[PDB]
Amino acid sequence: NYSRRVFTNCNYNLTKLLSLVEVDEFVCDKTTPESLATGCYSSLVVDW
Amino acid sequence: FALPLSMKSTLAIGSAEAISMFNYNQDYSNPTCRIHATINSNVSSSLN
Ligand SMILES: *[C@@H]1O[C@H](CO)[C@@H](O[C@@H]2O[C@H](CO)[C@@H](O[C@@H]3O[C@H](CO)[C@@H](O)[C@H](O)[C@@H]3O)[C@H](O)[C@H]2NC(C)=O)[C@H](O)[C@H]1NC(C)=O
Numbered sequence: 001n002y003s004r005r006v007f008t009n010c011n012y013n014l015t016k017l018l019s020l021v022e023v024d025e026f027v028c029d030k031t032t033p034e035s036l037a038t039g040c041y042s043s044l045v046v047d048w
Numbered sequence: 049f050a051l052p053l054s055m056k057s058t059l060a061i062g063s064a065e066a067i068s069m070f071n072y073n074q075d076y077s078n079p080t081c082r083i084h085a086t087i088n089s090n091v092s093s094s095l096n
């Protein structure tokens with residue numbers, strides 16, 4: 001039973017979030033974590 | 049340089065942490081090979 005949130009019309013601080021998380025592995029294509037910290041995208045859907 | 053294996057994904061391409069931004073940033077225009085090696089204690093005490 002995993003939670004899902006959708007964030008639209010929003011702004012966020014990457015340094016605030018990454019100060020609390022020790023990332024061990026990221027895998028993805030069509031985008032990069034550097035791109036998510038620089039570019040602007042239409043919507044953001046997060047599952048955790 | 050020295051870096052723990054718990055943050056081996058920090059040097060992965062596309063990462064957005066502070067190491068890949070302000071510290072050593074890898075150049076990928078030439079054939080590289082990043083190696084994460086662990087030097088054991090006995091051979092480390094042998095060669096100072
Ligand atoms: C969220 O992002 C903002 C920037 O987009 C980060 O803001 C900066 O935070 C540091 C402290 O974490 C601030 O430093 C402080 O500055 C005052 C200025 O006089 C100084 O007196 C203090 O001793 C301290 O050094 C810095 O000013 C601030 N920059 C801004 C607001 O433009 C913030 O760190 C990020 N959030 C987290 C949780 O890291």
Ligand SMILES: CCCCC/C=C\C/C=C\CCCCCCCC(=O)O
Nearest residue numbers: 017021023026033036057063064065
């Ligand atoms: C790790 C953060 C967890 C929560 C993130 C959720 C929402 C924020 C949305 C976009 C920011 C992109 C995350 C940056 C990934 C860093 C990967 C790494 O440093 O290797």
Ligand SMILES: *[C@@H]1O[C@H](CO)[C@@H](O)[C@H](O)[C@H]1NC(C)=O
Nearest residue numbers: 001002003004005046047048
């Ligand atoms: C599933 O998660 C939602 C989100 O908080 C919660 O409201 C719900 O009670 C959960 N259901 C369970 C634990 O059976």
